[PDB]
């Protein structure tokens, strides 16, 4: 079991795993109630009005601009009951991901993926990077800094814009230099997307109303895979995009999909990135792990009193699977690097999780969303850790009937259609 406490949103704060916290954003903010569901992983059941100064409220953009696939509701996730349900929904989804061998591996890699202590401007000293921590209000009212890897937070204005956010460094590209950084995942367990079972229908923008619902566990896993990349500093620059020439409608609109998203989906999508660049990326991040080992070897003392130099050097030797001689000098073994790189990029994919969940799912990232549904996964009669919607020993166990929004219509309320627009 991944989440040892069944938190209720109204549980009293203790300054340990139920606390009012502040996020290291450049602006001001009122403390927000947060829940530590696992070592290094916190959940904030609030709409993310914090990580991005440009998204400080919940109203859509009124400047003759509006993205087609979007959904707005400024009251969602504003009541204590919604926040309680959000917390239990997210918890349930982590347990579902933890219930599979692949999910356990991913969550283990994510917990191990401590953002690198590269904040020191002096080579002989190892120092944390402040924006990889939160500030936790203690029972005496004072703040203490706590390192963390992952935050699950509510979506911003656009409810169905699920994405990873993280704080940048002035000089460093933390998500693409091997360092990594604390990841804020905007996510909701209260909505899901509809897709079409037929491939030609799913990839056509004019057809389908979204007969089947995506298992939210897959959506979170997709998100967590992205966070794994960025926590290990191997995320592919989103400016590297594949000019889709395999879907006449994508080409018609000149749609480009980032290599990072094709990689995350896996399956055939990941094959659109040809060998020459794949090799280039691998070699690029292999060197970054070399510079990390070269930084560790120069560090002779540590900054602060939270942990010893020896301990932090070992934390990063285990994160990056470095090699260590008797004198403590670290190096990167190409074999072990390729092992970890492939693990994070090819083993952890959305298409692989589909196999472990035994759910129905979009066959490619290169499709067209059909509709968005309101769901409630907290009741065991709706959704279980082990089966998602396809509850065993009911009519929903077979043929993914649980995700069939026409057969299981009581579990889905269609809110918006995207076909045609
Ligand atoms: Hg993400």
UniProtKB/Swiss-Prot annotation:
It is found in: Secreted; Host cytoplasm, Host cytosol. The record marks 362, 365 as: Transition state stabilizer. Zn(2+) binds at residues 222, 226, 261. Changing residue 350 to A/Q: Wild-type KM for SNAP25, no protease activity, about 30% less Zn(2+). Changing residue 362 to A/H/K: Wild-type KM for SNAP25, about 75-fold decrease in kcat, no effect on Zn(2+) binding. Changing residue 365 to A: Light chain has 40% cleavage activity on SNAP25, 30% decrease in Zn(2+). Has slow autocatalytic activity, cleaves 250-Tyr-Tyr-251, 266-Phe-Gly-267, 419-Phe-Thr-420, 423-Phe-Glu-424, 430-Cys-Val-431, 432-Arg-Gly-433, 438-Lys-Thr-439, and probably 429-Leu-Cys-430 over a period of 4 weeks. Catalysis of the '197-Gln-|-Arg-198' bond in SNAP25 is estimated to be 10(5) more efficient than autocatalysis, leaving the physiological importance of autocatalysis in doubt. Ubiquitinated by host HECD2. Deubiquitination by host VCPIP1 prevents degradation by the proteasome. The active site is at 223 (proton acceptor). Signal peptide: none annotated. Has proteolytic activity. After translocation into the eukaryotic host cytosol LC hydrolyzes the '197-Gln-|-Arg-198' bond in SNAP25, blocking neurotransmitter release. Recognizes the '146-Met--Gly-155' region of SNAP25, which confers substrate specificity. Hydrolyzes the '202-Thr-|-Arg-203' bond of mouse SNAP23, but not in human which has a different sequence. Reduction of the interchain disulfide bond occurs in the host cytosol and probably prevents retrotranslocation into the synaptic vesicle. Has protease activity. This is Botulinum neurotoxin A light chain. The gene is botA. The chain holds residues 2 to 422 of 1296 of the full protein.
């Amino acid at each position: 079991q991944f989440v040892n406490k069944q938190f209720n949103y109204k549980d009293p704060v203790n300054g340990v795993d139920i606390a009012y916290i502040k996020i290291p954003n450049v602006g001001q903010m009122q403390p927000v109630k947060a829940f530590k569901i696992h070592n290094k992983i916190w959940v904030i059941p609030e709409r993310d009005t914090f990580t991005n100064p440009e998204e400080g409220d919940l109203n859509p953009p009124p400047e003759a601009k509006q993205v087609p696939v979007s959904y707005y509701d400024s009251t969602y996730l504003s009541t204590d009951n919604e926040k309680d349900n959000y917390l239990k929904g997210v918890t349930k989804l982590f347990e579902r991901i933890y219930s599979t061998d692949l999910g356990r591996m991913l969550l283990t890699s994510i917990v191990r993926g401590i953002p690198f202590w590269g904040g020191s401007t002096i080579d002989t000293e190892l120092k944390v990077i402040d924006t990889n921590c939160i500030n936790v209000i203690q029972p005496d009212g004072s703040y203490r800094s706590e390192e963390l890897n992952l935050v699950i937070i509510g979506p911003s204005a656009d409810i169905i814009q699920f994405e990873c956010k993280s704080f940048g460094h002035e000089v460093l590209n933390l998500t693409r230099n091997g360092y990594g950084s604390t990841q804020y995942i905007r996510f909701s367990p209260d909505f899901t997307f509809g897709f079409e079972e037929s491939l030609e229908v799913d990839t056509n923008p004019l057809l389908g109303a979204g007969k089947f619902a995506t298992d939210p566990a897959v959506t979170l896993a997709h998100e967590l895979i992205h966070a794994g990349h960025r926590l290990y500093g191997i995320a592919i620059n989103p400016n590297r995009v594949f000019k889709v020439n395999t879907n006449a409608y994508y080409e018609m609109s000149g749609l480009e999909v980032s290599f990072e998203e094709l990689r995350t989906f896996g399956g055939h999508d990941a094959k659109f990135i040809d060998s020459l660049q794949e090799n280039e990326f691998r070699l690029y991040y292999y060197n970054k792990f070399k510079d990390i080992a070269s930084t560790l070897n120069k560090a002779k003392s540590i900054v602060g009193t939270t942990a010893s130099l020896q301990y932090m050097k070992n934390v990063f030797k285990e994160k990056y699977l470095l090699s260590e001689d008797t004198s403590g000098k670290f190096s990167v073994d190409k074999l072990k690097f390729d092992k970890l790189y492939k693990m994070l990029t090819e083993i952890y994919t959305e298409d692989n999780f589909v196999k472990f969940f035994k759910v129905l799912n979009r066959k490619t990232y290169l499709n067209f969303d059909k509709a968005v549904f309101k769901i409630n996964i907290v009741p065991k009669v709706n959704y279980t850790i082990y089966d998602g919607f396809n509850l065993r020993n009911t009519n929903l166990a077979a043929n993914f009937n649980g995700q069939n929004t026409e057969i299981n219509n009581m579990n889905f309320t269609k809110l918006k259609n995207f076909t045609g627009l």
